[PDB]
Structure formats: structure tokens, C-alpha cells
PDB file of C-alpha atoms and ligand atoms in Angstrom:
ATOM      1  CA  UNK A   1      15.418   9.378 -11.215  1.00  0.00           C
ATOM      2  CA  UNK A   2      15.793   8.301 -14.855  1.00  0.00           C
ATOM      3  CA  UNK A   3      13.877   5.409 -13.265  1.00  0.00           C
ATOM      4  CA  UNK A   4      13.716   2.231 -15.231  1.00  0.00           C
ATOM      5  CA  UNK A   5      12.405  -0.068 -12.580  1.00  0.00           C
ATOM      6  CA  UNK A   6       9.078  -1.782 -13.305  1.00  0.00           C
ATOM      7  CA  UNK A   7       7.857  -5.325 -12.767  1.00  0.00           C
ATOM      8  CA  UNK A   8       8.995  -6.768 -16.154  1.00  0.00           C
ATOM      9  CA  UNK A   9      11.421  -9.631 -16.669  1.00  0.00           C
ATOM     10  CA  UNK A  10      14.150  -7.017 -17.340  1.00  0.00           C
ATOM     11  CA  UNK A  11      13.544  -4.230 -14.775  1.00  0.00           C
ATOM     12  CA  UNK A  12      11.576  -6.295 -12.229  1.00  0.00           C
ATOM     13  CA  UNK A  13      11.920  -7.165  -8.564  1.00  0.00           C
ATOM     14  CA  UNK A  14      14.967  -9.471  -9.154  1.00  0.00           C
ATOM     15  CA  UNK A  15      16.931  -6.689 -10.900  1.00  0.00           C
ATOM     16  CA  UNK A  16      16.247  -3.746  -8.515  1.00  0.00           C
ATOM     17  CA  UNK A  17      19.402  -4.347  -6.456  1.00  0.00           C
ATOM     18  CA  UNK A  18      21.497  -3.523  -9.545  1.00  0.00           C
ATOM     19  CA  UNK A  19      20.275   0.073  -8.999  1.00  0.00           C
ATOM     20  CA  UNK A  20      18.869   0.009  -5.450  1.00  0.00           C
ATOM     21  CA  UNK A  21      21.331  -2.012  -3.361  1.00  0.00           C
ATOM     22  CA  UNK A  22      19.064  -1.476  -0.317  1.00  0.00           C
ATOM     23  CA  UNK A  23      16.824  -3.966  -2.082  1.00  0.00           C
ATOM     24  CA  UNK A  24      18.961  -6.579  -0.234  1.00  0.00           C
ATOM     25  CA  UNK A  25      18.727  -4.760   3.152  1.00  0.00           C
ATOM     26  CA  UNK A  26      17.761  -6.290   6.470  1.00  0.00           C
ATOM     27  CA  UNK A  27      14.393  -4.525   6.778  1.00  0.00           C
ATOM     28  CA  UNK A  28      12.789  -5.166   3.377  1.00  0.00           C
ATOM     29  CA  UNK A  29       9.070  -5.554   2.753  1.00  0.00           C
ATOM     30  CA  UNK A  30       6.797  -7.386   2.184  1.00  0.00           C
ATOM     31  CA  UNK A  31       7.306 -10.498   4.335  1.00  0.00           C
ATOM     32  CA  UNK A  32       5.528 -13.746   5.114  1.00  0.00           C
ATOM     33  CA  UNK A  33       3.566 -13.718   8.360  1.00  0.00           C
ATOM     34  CA  UNK A  34       3.974 -16.933  10.339  1.00  0.00           C
ATOM     35  CA  UNK A  35       1.212 -16.895  12.923  1.00  0.00           C
ATOM     36  CA  UNK A  36       2.976 -19.619  14.868  1.00  0.00           C
ATOM     37  CA  UNK A  37       5.903 -17.193  15.320  1.00  0.00           C
ATOM     38  CA  UNK A  38       4.178 -13.853  15.976  1.00  0.00           C
ATOM     39  CA  UNK A  39       4.552 -12.317  19.446  1.00  0.00           C
ATOM     40  CA  UNK A  40       1.708 -10.895  21.530  1.00  0.00           C
ATOM     41  CA  UNK A  41       2.619  -7.377  22.678  1.00  0.00           C
ATOM     42  CA  UNK A  42       0.225  -6.148  25.392  1.00  0.00           C
ATOM     43  CA  UNK A  43       1.265  -2.475  25.048  1.00  0.00           C
ATOM     44  CA  UNK A  44      -0.295  -2.211  21.565  1.00  0.00           C
ATOM     45  CA  UNK A  45      -3.224   0.171  21.681  1.00  0.00           C
ATOM     46  CA  UNK A  46      -6.217   0.034  19.391  1.00  0.00           C
ATOM     47  CA  UNK A  47      -5.523   1.753  16.123  1.00  0.00           C
ATOM     48  CA  UNK A  48      -7.696   4.849  15.613  1.00  0.00           C
ATOM     49  CA  UNK A  49      -8.160   6.508  12.190  1.00  0.00           C
ATOM     50  CA  UNK A  50      -9.843   9.898  11.756  1.00  0.00           C
ATOM     51  CA  UNK A  51     -10.099  11.002   8.188  1.00  0.00           C
ATOM     52  CA  UNK A  52     -11.838  14.080   6.736  1.00  0.00           C
ATOM     53  CA  UNK A  53     -13.434  13.240   3.359  1.00  0.00           C
ATOM     54  CA  UNK A  54     -12.955  16.887   2.403  1.00  0.00           C
ATOM     55  CA  UNK A  55      -9.217  16.191   2.273  1.00  0.00           C
ATOM     56  CA  UNK A  56      -9.460  13.758  -0.681  1.00  0.00           C
ATOM     57  CA  UNK A  57      -8.136  15.581  -3.734  1.00  0.00           C
ATOM     58  CA  UNK A  58      -7.008  13.614  -6.841  1.00  0.00           C
ATOM     59  CA  UNK A  59      -6.470  10.228  -8.519  1.00  0.00           C
ATOM     60  CA  UNK A  60      -3.483   9.796 -10.879  1.00  0.00           C
ATOM     61  CA  UNK A  61      -1.950   7.122 -13.125  1.00  0.00           C
ATOM     62  CA  UNK A  62       1.686   6.753 -12.106  1.00  0.00           C
ATOM     63  CA  UNK A  63       2.517   4.213 -14.828  1.00  0.00           C
ATOM     64  CA  UNK A  64       3.202   1.200 -12.554  1.00  0.00           C
ATOM     65  CA  UNK A  65      -0.056   1.876 -10.626  1.00  0.00           C
ATOM     66  CA  UNK A  66      -2.675   4.514  -9.639  1.00  0.00           C
ATOM     67  CA  UNK A  67      -2.763   6.686  -6.462  1.00  0.00           C
ATOM     68  CA  UNK A  68      -5.562   8.525  -4.629  1.00  0.00           C
ATOM     69  CA  UNK A  69      -3.873  11.632  -3.108  1.00  0.00           C
ATOM     70  CA  UNK A  70      -4.939  13.530  -0.054  1.00  0.00           C
ATOM     71  CA  UNK A  71      -4.298  17.107   1.081  1.00  0.00           C
ATOM     72  CA  UNK A  72      -1.602  16.819   3.796  1.00  0.00           C
ATOM     73  CA  UNK A  73      -1.219  20.446   4.989  1.00  0.00           C
ATOM     74  CA  UNK A  74      -3.160  19.781   8.177  1.00  0.00           C
ATOM     75  CA  UNK A  75      -3.755  17.108  10.750  1.00  0.00           C
ATOM     76  CA  UNK A  76      -7.357  16.945   9.530  1.00  0.00           C
ATOM     77  CA  UNK A  77      -6.900  13.240   8.573  1.00  0.00           C
ATOM     78  CA  UNK A  78      -4.750  11.122  10.901  1.00  0.00           C
ATOM     79  CA  UNK A  79      -4.032   7.755  12.404  1.00  0.00           C
ATOM     80  CA  UNK A  80      -3.057   7.180  16.042  1.00  0.00           C
ATOM     81  CA  UNK A  81      -2.642   4.400  18.558  1.00  0.00           C
ATOM     82  CA  UNK A  82      -1.520   0.905  17.586  1.00  0.00           C
ATOM     83  CA  UNK A  83       2.228   1.107  18.356  1.00  0.00           C
ATOM     84  CA  UNK A  84       2.599   4.840  17.989  1.00  0.00           C
ATOM     85  CA  UNK A  85       3.118   7.628  20.437  1.00  0.00           C
ATOM     86  CA  UNK A  86       2.505  10.355  17.820  1.00  0.00           C
ATOM     87  CA  UNK A  87       0.009  11.074  15.055  1.00  0.00           C
ATOM     88  CA  UNK A  88       0.557  10.244  11.351  1.00  0.00           C
ATOM     89  CA  UNK A  89      -0.975  12.337   8.550  1.00  0.00           C
ATOM     90  CA  UNK A  90      -2.772  10.535   5.665  1.00  0.00           C
ATOM     91  CA  UNK A  91      -1.399  11.309   2.224  1.00  0.00           C
ATOM     92  CA  UNK A  92      -2.522   8.410  -0.020  1.00  0.00           C
ATOM     93  CA  UNK A  93      -4.111   4.988  -0.685  1.00  0.00           C
ATOM     94  CA  UNK A  94      -3.285   2.565  -3.591  1.00  0.00           C
ATOM     95  CA  UNK A  95      -3.487  -1.141  -4.542  1.00  0.00           C
ATOM     96  CA  UNK A  96      -1.288  -4.057  -5.530  1.00  0.00           C
ATOM     97  CA  UNK A  97      -2.494  -6.956  -7.746  1.00  0.00           C
ATOM     98  CA  UNK A  98      -1.223  -9.844  -9.896  1.00  0.00           C
ATOM     99  CA  UNK A  99      -1.769 -11.133 -13.407  1.00  0.00           C
ATOM    100  CA  UNK A 100      -4.000 -13.864 -12.021  1.00  0.00           C
ATOM    101  CA  UNK A 101      -6.934 -13.119  -9.705  1.00  0.00           C
ATOM    102  CA  UNK A 102      -5.791 -15.663  -7.104  1.00  0.00           C
ATOM    103  CA  UNK A 103      -2.173 -14.647  -6.493  1.00  0.00           C
ATOM    104  CA  UNK A 104      -1.540 -10.910  -6.331  1.00  0.00           C
ATOM    105  CA  UNK A 105      -0.982  -9.696  -2.736  1.00  0.00           C
ATOM    106  CA  UNK A 106       2.366  -8.443  -1.423  1.00  0.00           C
ATOM    107  CA  UNK A 107       2.289  -9.750   2.179  1.00  0.00           C
ATOM    108  CA  UNK A 108       1.525 -13.469   2.660  1.00  0.00           C
ATOM    109  CA  UNK A 109       0.039 -15.208   5.735  1.00  0.00           C
ATOM    110  CA  UNK A 110       1.294 -18.683   6.643  1.00  0.00           C
ATOM    111  CA  UNK A 111       2.747 -18.820   3.124  1.00  0.00           C
ATOM    112  CA  UNK A 112      -0.596 -18.117   1.456  1.00  0.00           C
ATOM    113  CA  UNK A 113      -0.803 -15.352  -1.158  1.00  0.00           C
ATOM    114  CA  UNK A 114      -4.089 -13.451  -1.351  1.00  0.00           C
ATOM    115  CA  UNK A 115      -5.589 -11.904  -4.531  1.00  0.00           C
ATOM    116  CA  UNK A 116      -4.673  -8.205  -3.962  1.00  0.00           C
ATOM    117  CA  UNK A 117      -3.715  -5.654  -1.273  1.00  0.00           C
ATOM    118  CA  UNK A 118      -4.872  -2.149  -0.268  1.00  0.00           C
ATOM    119  CA  UNK A 119      -2.146   0.183   1.184  1.00  0.00           C
ATOM    120  CA  UNK A 120      -3.189   3.380   3.104  1.00  0.00           C
ATOM    121  CA  UNK A 121       0.009   5.393   3.797  1.00  0.00           C
ATOM    122  CA  UNK A 122       0.745   8.075   6.296  1.00  0.00           C
ATOM    123  CA  UNK A 123       3.720  10.195   7.392  1.00  0.00           C
ATOM    124  CA  UNK A 124       5.034  11.427  10.766  1.00  0.00           C
ATOM    125  CA  UNK A 125       3.923  15.096  10.999  1.00  0.00           C
ATOM    126  CA  UNK A 126       4.876  15.091  14.682  1.00  0.00           C
ATOM    127  CA  UNK A 127       8.596  14.552  13.880  1.00  0.00           C
ATOM    128  CA  UNK A 128       9.278  15.801  10.318  1.00  0.00           C
ATOM    129  CA  UNK A 129       8.412  18.923   8.279  1.00  0.00           C
ATOM    130  CA  UNK A 130       7.246  17.140   5.118  1.00  0.00           C
ATOM    131  CA  UNK A 131       6.647  13.753   3.549  1.00  0.00           C
ATOM    132  CA  UNK A 132       9.895  14.096   1.581  1.00  0.00           C
ATOM    133  CA  UNK A 133      12.083  14.291   4.715  1.00  0.00           C
ATOM    134  CA  UNK A 134      10.271  11.553   6.600  1.00  0.00           C
ATOM    135  CA  UNK A 135      10.184   9.122   3.687  1.00  0.00           C
ATOM    136  CA  UNK A 136      13.744   8.087   4.373  1.00  0.00           C
ATOM    137  CA  UNK A 137      13.688   8.105   8.196  1.00  0.00           C
ATOM    138  CA  UNK A 138      13.033   4.925  10.275  1.00  0.00           C
ATOM    139  CA  UNK A 139       9.824   6.261  11.942  1.00  0.00           C
ATOM    140  CA  UNK A 140       8.897   8.291   8.901  1.00  0.00           C
ATOM    141  CA  UNK A 141       5.937   6.419   7.445  1.00  0.00           C
ATOM    142  CA  UNK A 142       3.142   4.171   8.624  1.00  0.00           C
ATOM    143  CA  UNK A 143       1.191   2.054   6.142  1.00  0.00           C
ATOM    144  CA  UNK A 144      -2.011   0.091   6.791  1.00  0.00           C
ATOM    145  CA  UNK A 145      -2.166  -3.097   4.663  1.00  0.00           C
ATOM    146  CA  UNK A 146      -5.395  -5.032   3.994  1.00  0.00           C
ATOM    147  CA  UNK A 147      -5.374  -8.338   2.157  1.00  0.00           C
ATOM    148  CA  UNK A 148      -8.068  -8.758  -0.524  1.00  0.00           C
ATOM    149  CA  UNK A 149      -9.632 -12.187  -1.167  1.00  0.00           C
ATOM    150  CA  UNK A 150     -11.325 -12.965  -4.496  1.00  0.00           C
ATOM    151  CA  UNK A 151     -15.013 -13.635  -4.081  1.00  0.00           C
ATOM    152  CA  UNK A 152     -18.145 -11.524  -3.936  1.00  0.00           C
ATOM    153  CA  UNK A 153     -18.035  -8.012  -5.477  1.00  0.00           C
ATOM    154  CA  UNK A 154     -17.091  -5.235  -3.064  1.00  0.00           C
ATOM    155  CA  UNK A 155     -19.601  -2.386  -3.367  1.00  0.00           C
ATOM    156  CA  UNK A 156     -17.386  -0.047  -1.347  1.00  0.00           C
ATOM    157  CA  UNK A 157     -14.840   0.107  -4.215  1.00  0.00           C
ATOM    158  CA  UNK A 158     -17.266   1.529  -6.796  1.00  0.00           C
ATOM    159  CA  UNK A 159     -16.297   5.231  -6.508  1.00  0.00           C
ATOM    160  CA  UNK A 160     -12.614   4.265  -7.052  1.00  0.00           C
ATOM    161  CA  UNK A 161     -13.420   2.124 -10.136  1.00  0.00           C
ATOM    162  CA  UNK A 162     -15.816   4.647 -11.746  1.00  0.00           C
ATOM    163  CA  UNK A 163     -12.981   7.129 -11.440  1.00  0.00           C
ATOM    164  CA  UNK A 164     -10.496   5.009 -13.417  1.00  0.00           C
ATOM    165  CA  UNK A 165     -12.168   5.839 -16.749  1.00  0.00           C
ATOM    166  CA  UNK A 166     -10.585   9.323 -16.501  1.00  0.00           C
ATOM    167  CA  UNK A 167      -6.991   8.159 -15.812  1.00  0.00           C
ATOM    168  CA  UNK A 168      -6.576   5.400 -18.412  1.00  0.00           C
ATOM    169  CA  UNK A 169      -3.046   6.484 -19.380  1.00  0.00           C
ATOM    170  CA  UNK A 170       0.194   7.424 -17.655  1.00  0.00           C
ATOM    171  CA  UNK A 171       0.220  10.835 -16.134  1.00  0.00           C
ATOM    172  CA  UNK A 172      -3.483  11.590 -16.430  1.00  0.00           C
ATOM    173  CA  UNK A 173      -4.998  13.047 -13.235  1.00  0.00           C
ATOM    174  CA  UNK A 174      -8.561  13.859 -12.075  1.00  0.00           C
ATOM    175  CA  UNK A 175     -10.238  15.552  -9.100  1.00  0.00           C
ATOM    176  CA  UNK A 176     -11.355  12.818  -6.595  1.00  0.00           C
ATOM    177  CA  UNK A 177     -13.200  14.336  -3.647  1.00  0.00           C
ATOM    178  CA  UNK A 178     -15.321  13.863  -0.573  1.00  0.00           C
ATOM    179  CA  UNK A 179     -14.158  10.371   0.322  1.00  0.00           C
ATOM    180  CA  UNK A 180     -13.163   8.590   3.515  1.00  0.00           C
ATOM    181  CA  UNK A 181     -10.802   5.675   2.979  1.00  0.00           C
ATOM    182  CA  UNK A 182     -11.796   4.192   6.373  1.00  0.00           C
ATOM    183  CA  UNK A 183     -14.942   2.908   4.559  1.00  0.00           C
ATOM    184  CA  UNK A 184     -12.490   0.435   2.919  1.00  0.00           C
ATOM    185  CA  UNK A 185     -11.153  -1.095   6.096  1.00  0.00           C
ATOM    186  CA  UNK A 186     -12.600  -4.311   7.573  1.00  0.00           C
ATOM    187  CA  UNK A 187     -14.687  -4.198  10.814  1.00  0.00           C
ATOM    188  CA  UNK A 188     -11.972  -5.735  13.059  1.00  0.00           C
ATOM    189  CA  UNK A 189      -9.415  -3.749  15.044  1.00  0.00           C
ATOM    190  CA  UNK A 190      -6.885  -6.658  15.391  1.00  0.00           C
ATOM    191  CA  UNK A 191      -3.573  -6.507  13.526  1.00  0.00           C
ATOM    192  CA  UNK A 192       0.059  -7.569  13.077  1.00  0.00           C
ATOM    193  CA  UNK A 193       2.903  -4.971  13.013  1.00  0.00           C
ATOM    194  CA  UNK A 194       6.590  -5.022  12.006  1.00  0.00           C
ATOM    195  CA  UNK A 195       9.269  -2.550  10.869  1.00  0.00           C
ATOM    196  CA  UNK A 196       9.895  -2.693   7.117  1.00  0.00           C
ATOM    197  CA  UNK A 197      10.100  -0.674   3.964  1.00  0.00           C
ATOM    198  CA  UNK A 198       8.517   0.658   0.863  1.00  0.00           C
ATOM    199  CA  UNK A 199       7.736  -2.344  -1.394  1.00  0.00           C
ATOM    200  CA  UNK A 200       9.146  -0.562  -4.417  1.00  0.00           C
ATOM    201  CA  UNK A 201      11.936   1.798  -5.348  1.00  0.00           C
ATOM    202  CA  UNK A 202      13.388   3.760  -3.698  1.00  0.00           C
ATOM    203  CA  UNK A 203      12.756   0.968  -1.134  1.00  0.00           C
ATOM    204  CA  UNK A 204      13.538   3.061   2.008  1.00  0.00           C
ATOM    205  CA  UNK A 205      13.425   1.225   5.372  1.00  0.00           C
ATOM    206  CA  UNK A 206      11.070   3.816   6.754  1.00  0.00           C
ATOM    207  CA  UNK A 207       7.785   2.059   7.292  1.00  0.00           C
ATOM    208  CA  UNK A 208       6.117   0.687  10.326  1.00  0.00           C
ATOM    209  CA  UNK A 209       3.546  -1.709   8.802  1.00  0.00           C
ATOM    210  CA  UNK A 210       0.074  -2.416  10.149  1.00  0.00           C
ATOM    211  CA  UNK A 211      -1.452  -5.649   8.643  1.00  0.00           C
ATOM    212  CA  UNK A 212      -5.164  -6.049   9.398  1.00  0.00           C
ATOM    213  CA  UNK A 213      -6.100  -9.479  10.655  1.00  0.00           C
ATOM    214  CA  UNK A 214      -9.321  -9.560   8.568  1.00  0.00           C
ATOM    215  CA  UNK A 215      -9.309  -9.496   4.745  1.00  0.00           C
ATOM    216  CA  UNK A 216     -11.911  -7.771   2.529  1.00  0.00           C
ATOM    217  CA  UNK A 217     -13.499  -9.174  -0.670  1.00  0.00           C
ATOM    218  CA  UNK A 218     -13.131  -8.122  -4.327  1.00  0.00           C
ATOM    219  CA  UNK A 219     -14.460  -9.904  -7.471  1.00  0.00           C
ATOM    220  CA  UNK A 220     -12.623 -10.958 -10.600  1.00  0.00           C
ATOM    221  CA  UNK A 221     -14.291  -8.279 -12.720  1.00  0.00           C
ATOM    222  CA  UNK A 222     -13.261  -5.678 -10.175  1.00  0.00           C
ATOM    223  CA  UNK A 223      -9.642  -6.795 -10.483  1.00  0.00           C
ATOM    224  CA  UNK A 224      -9.879  -6.925 -14.243  1.00  0.00           C
ATOM    225  CA  UNK A 225     -10.664  -3.183 -14.140  1.00  0.00           C
ATOM    226  CA  UNK A 226      -7.383  -2.559 -12.329  1.00  0.00           C
ATOM    227  CA  UNK A 227      -5.553  -4.609 -14.892  1.00  0.00           C
ATOM    228  CA  UNK A 228      -7.143  -2.636 -17.771  1.00  0.00           C
ATOM    229  CA  UNK A 229      -5.386   0.694 -17.016  1.00  0.00           C
ATOM    230  CA  UNK A 230      -2.282   1.319 -19.170  1.00  0.00           C
ATOM    231  CA  UNK A 231       1.313   2.304 -18.426  1.00  0.00           C
ATOM    232  CA  UNK A 232       1.999   4.118 -21.721  1.00  0.00           C
ATOM    233  CA  UNK A 233       1.249   7.784 -22.357  1.00  0.00           C
ATOM    234  CA  UNK A 234      -1.855   8.631 -24.451  1.00  0.00           C
ATOM    235  CA  UNK A 235      -1.272   8.124 -28.193  1.00  0.00           C
ATOM    236  CA  UNK A 236       1.205   5.244 -27.825  1.00  0.00           C
ATOM    237  CA  UNK A 237       0.614   1.488 -28.211  1.00  0.00           C
ATOM    238  CA  UNK A 238      -1.399  -0.038 -25.260  1.00  0.00           C
ATOM    239  CA  UNK A 239       0.655  -1.631 -22.445  1.00  0.00           C
ATOM    240  CA  UNK A 240      -1.564  -2.973 -19.645  1.00  0.00           C
ATOM    241  CA  UNK A 241      -0.644  -2.637 -15.947  1.00  0.00           C
ATOM    242  CA  UNK A 242      -0.722  -6.460 -15.612  1.00  0.00           C
ATOM    243  CA  UNK A 243       0.922  -6.714 -12.216  1.00  0.00           C
ATOM    244  CA  UNK A 244       2.730  -4.676  -9.542  1.00  0.00           C
ATOM    245  CA  UNK A 245       3.398  -7.029  -6.606  1.00  0.00           C
ATOM    246  CA  UNK A 246       6.847  -7.677  -5.184  1.00  0.00           C
ATOM    247  CA  UNK A 247       8.040 -11.001  -3.805  1.00  0.00           C
ATOM    248  CA  UNK A 248       8.194 -11.523   0.000  1.00  0.00           C
ATOM    249  CA  UNK A 249      11.588 -10.923   1.578  1.00  0.00           C
ATOM    250  CA  UNK A 250      13.650 -12.486   4.355  1.00  0.00           C
ATOM    251  CA  UNK A 251      12.834 -11.382   7.917  1.00  0.00           C
ATOM    252  CA  UNK A 252      16.514 -11.283   8.926  1.00  0.00           C
ATOM    253  CA  UNK A 253      15.379 -11.575  12.479  1.00  0.00           C
ATOM    254  CA  UNK A 254      12.678  -8.983  12.794  1.00  0.00           C
ATOM    255  CA  UNK A 255       9.698  -9.754  15.031  1.00  0.00           C
ATOM    256  CA  UNK A 256       6.048  -9.683  13.890  1.00  0.00           C
ATOM    257  CA  UNK A 257       3.980  -8.444  16.811  1.00  0.00           C
ATOM    258  CA  UNK A 258       0.252  -9.071  17.160  1.00  0.00           C
ATOM    259  CA  UNK A 259      -2.455  -7.117  18.969  1.00  0.00           C
ATOM    260  CA  UNK A 260      -4.077 -10.391  20.033  1.00  0.00           C
TER     261      UNK A 260
HETATM  262 HG1   HG B 301      -6.042  -7.848   5.920  1.00  0.00          HG
HETATM  263 HG1   HG B 302     -13.500   0.297   9.711  1.00  0.00          HG
HETATM  264 HG1   HG B 303      -8.395  -0.904  12.697  1.00  0.00          HG
HETATM  265 HG1   HG B 304      -6.764  -2.857  10.540  1.00  0.00          HG
HETATM  266 HG1   HG B 305      -7.397  -4.018  11.374  1.00  0.00          HG
HETATM  267 ZN1   ZN B 306       1.943  -0.223  -1.793  1.00  0.00          ZN
END
């Protein structure tokens, strides 16, 4: 705690190791996805998501970004299949973006950086008691990643953007209800998967990543709305959340599997 990690030139991605030595681990995320080197695994099942909109509960400004939190006391909203034998409980969705509208994703494909990224995170309810315990275990979390390509406005995002007006500053929160994050996912069921980590402190190597093969659109004015939120508390001078995307890390011999 007493966290002074951010994305600035002084507390940014290239300084994290000073305080989080795992930052130089062997299973760090994100990574670049070389489609010439992926490996077709025929045991991969089709991913299946089953979310209850009644479980959406709040939206909050965390300073470096904003999170949409879900009620995780039940198995009412879960993800199964893909490479898993158990079910993962949904707890949140959030986004990553850059200071420019063309280069802001976390994962890259064939060395190409997209405009932004959606992350829909889940924890292993079949193996651990709470999110807190699982967060640091190897099979603890499962995150779905969807690359966002700048283009035509994405109507599906509207409810999330309208909501932003109530969480302008750090630590504000607001009720966010009746919403199914599966409405945000692309049609396609194909994907890439690899073992990695959290893309920001504490950087635990506890995530089994699911990268969707199809990207979704977003427009420049949509992205400018993200960039307009502030990281300061209310009453202070305005500091815009300009970017929150970490650089891709070395594979260190991990294998990216593909469902196709
Ligand atoms: Hg994608
Ligand atoms: Hg879908
Ligand atoms: Hg899918
Ligand atoms: Hg997907
Ligand atoms: Hg997918
Ligand atoms: Zn994320």
C-alpha cells in the first residue's frame, strides 16, 4: 500500500520493479501475439459466459482508471469452458487506453498496437474462498481481453459513458445496475490463451488470459470521454487520466494457444 505507482515518467511501467520486483518475472502480461507462432490446441472448448444483469452494482473512479463492479457472492454470473475445468465468477470489467487514439491497447497482435482494450475479469470460486485469496494463486483469475479499433462509434458503450459524468474524480462511486457485459463482446467464439499476470501492480502471475480473435470498434470521441476523467480528488487541480497501458513483456518461453 502507500502505492505510488502510476503511468507517469517517474512512477510508470519502467520504474515498477523498484517496488514490485515481480515486474521482471517470467509470466508477465501483456505480451505480443505472433500468429505465426501460436499453437492449435484441440482440447480447447468453446468459451461460455452466463451473466445476470441484476448482479451489476457500481462504477468507481480508482484514480488510474474506472471499474464496473459486480456482486460476487453467488455463481449467478460465470464463465466456463475455453481451457477451464471449473467455473469462474465475474467481479469486474474495465478499460485500457493511450494518449493517442491509435496506440493504446495492452496486448499487441503481430506487433500491431490497437487503440484500446476491454478487460472482463473473473475469479476461481471453485478453488478459493474469495477474490483476495485467489488473486495471488496461479489459477486464481481469468480475464477476457478484447482489442478495440478506432473507427465507427460503438453504440453498446453508451450506458458506460453516460455513467462517467457521476464519477469524474478519484474515489467517487455510483450505482450501476441491470447490465450484461456480454453485450460488449464480439460475435466470434475464437480466441488465443496464455498464462500471465495482472498488467499493473501488484502484478501477480495469477491470470489465465483469453484474447478474443475479433476486435470491436470505438470512435475518437468515445475515447476522449475516457481521457476526460480525472485522477485527483474533488476540489484539487485537474489531472486527466491520459493513459493507463503497460508495455508488452517478454514471453520467456510461454506458449500462446489458439482455439482455431
Ligand atoms: Hg479482440
Ligand atoms: Hg457475444
Ligand atoms: Hg466468446
Ligand atoms: Hg472472446
Ligand atoms: Hg472471443
Ligand atoms: Zn486491465
